[PDB]
């Protein structure tokens with residue numbers, strides 16, 4: 001039966017936003033984080049991981065998702081030395097299972113993790129936000145790897161590069177008891193001459209099939225998939241739930257059509273995603289995992305640099321999912337839990 | 350069946366600005382008062398228009414007026430009351446004379462509310478307002494004038510007197526309010542039971558009916574503050590809310606959360622499982638009855654190093670309140686078949 005742990009992203013010691021503050025978000029249970037002192041491709045030690053955990057748990061919370069044991073471009077590129085990098089991935093996996101963290105979250109997106117044309121695009125209310133202006137700048141080389149991809153490696157070269165990968169790590173993932181969750185490409189389509197393959201329903205279906213197991217699931221990031229209208233998140237989310245292969249939810253809204261795309265407040269009505277439908281769906285399928293609001297607007301004096309990762313609107317995101325998850329739970333004769341063990345401290349009757 | 354999510358604003362001197370109040374997803378209405386005519390004297394249109402103007406330019410409207418204060422002398426049924434009830438008559442005239450459809454007021458001797466502690470700690474390390482009975486047991490509440498206003502109430506005004514003093518006031522001002530199109534909504538007493546041997550009468554289901562009945566008319570309404578009434582365990586807010594809804598008698602909604610006991614009470618996060626009120630059931634009611642007027646999340650906790658010193662009127666947890674209600678509303682409207690709505694014209698500029 002259902003079990004959704006409201007979660008927040010936290011970059012660790014050097015985060016603008018603190019655990020004190022994250023904890024104050026009504027219903028917050030999971031911290032979604034990573035090790036940041038180990039170079040990409042290089043293998044996370046247990047101590048790095050337990051350091052983060054000790055901090056997070058003292059704050060009165062738990063790490064429920066490692067967001068991103070990063071994939072070395074060499075691996076993505078399909079270069080001969082991959083196995084070396086892959087064996088390191090296997091260690092990091094083994095190490096996270098060792099810390100008791102249920103899920104690992106990763107992308108297979110070549111040289112770029114995300115693309116945004118404007119980082120302060122105005123919205124109909126004064127708040128800024130990020131957008132992808134299909135017009136602006138677009139159609140210019142970003143000023144060796146890129147040319148490699150552009151020239152040689154096809155999408156199906158990437159499909160085989162990727163299957164090699166997940167075929168290498170999955171048994172390790174299984175023994176650690178860690179659920180992999182592949183993060184869609186963002187935007188979910190070819191740019192810059194680079195290829196993207198994790199982009200829609202057909203790909204989620206081919207990907208899961210790469211290695212048929214729950215240890216091999218997706219991170220349903222509705223705002224990424226829906227950054228291309230060619231995509232319908234609802235049937236995608238459902239297909240994926242019907243199949244038991246969502247291991248992580250992100251839940252940011254986005255407005256889109258043929259013109260490009262722009263991130264908006266989480267509220268279904270502010271963008272093109274019916275967020276109620278999304279969580280109603282998480283409800284009826286007794287989904288068990290974690291959800292993060294993910295990405296916000298710049299509202300108020302918001303001084304967090306690091307892009308959509310300011311506290312305020314992301315917090316205003318979780319409490320909206322609080323209302324959505326709770327109302328839908330009740331509607332179905334289901335009793336919602338938010339992990340509150342005490343209303344008060346020291347008073348009581 | 351359209352509920353206009355609103356938010357209280359204190360005029361030009363508020364550290365919370367409308368730029369900020371505007372940025373909360375779905376926020377439409379503002380809730381405000383005039384703060385320069387001393388109390389029982391008349392409210393000049395010059396003073397109200399210039400607040401609407403300040404509001405209407407920021408994208409928001411004035412949806413409801415949080416308090417033209419009834420003067421003590423009116424409440425005490427003193428002889429000089431008619432002069433004061435006069436000014437109050439016009440106050441009602443000027444407000445209708447400026448589009449704003451709801452005036453909210455109270456009938457609570459001596460105090461507008463009483464707490465014992467404005468930084469009581471909660472389990473998540475944040476602080477919130479509490480009223481601890483056992484901590485106000487010791488206390489004995491102009492400064493030398495209040496003394497004998499209390500004495501007057503204590504000794505010479507019984508509940509039934511105060512009921513009669515309210516009766517007068519009501520049939521005095523109620524025609525005026527039907528003549529200006531303004532709807533009166535009375536706040537529950539907070540706490541909803543006597544303290545310091547001072548009477549309170551707007552305290553529960555009984556009071557509601559009797560009050561409603563002084564003037565069986567849709568302009569004679571309550572502000573249904575679930576939190577105020579839920580501060581007494583003896584009360585069933587879900588029943589009281591429904592009761593008042595069948596009579597078309599809700600002219601405003603406050604949706605603050607408390608946890609109560611024989612011990613007193615404390616304000617909590619708006620979220621249900623954090624307090625004692627099932628907000629979902631509340632808004633479900635509001636929905637199931639096609640209610641119309643504005644809802645105001647109330648009293649937020651004190652989180653994220655907020656410094657604003659007014660009661661529970663920082664921006665943050667009040668804002669986290671509102672978008673929790675967005676989610677609770679939306680999810681309920683769809684669970685019915687109705688379609689929700691927020692301030693929302695353009696997704697993008």
Ligand SMILES: [Mn+2]
Nearest residue numbers: 574603605647
């Ligand atoms: Mn209130």
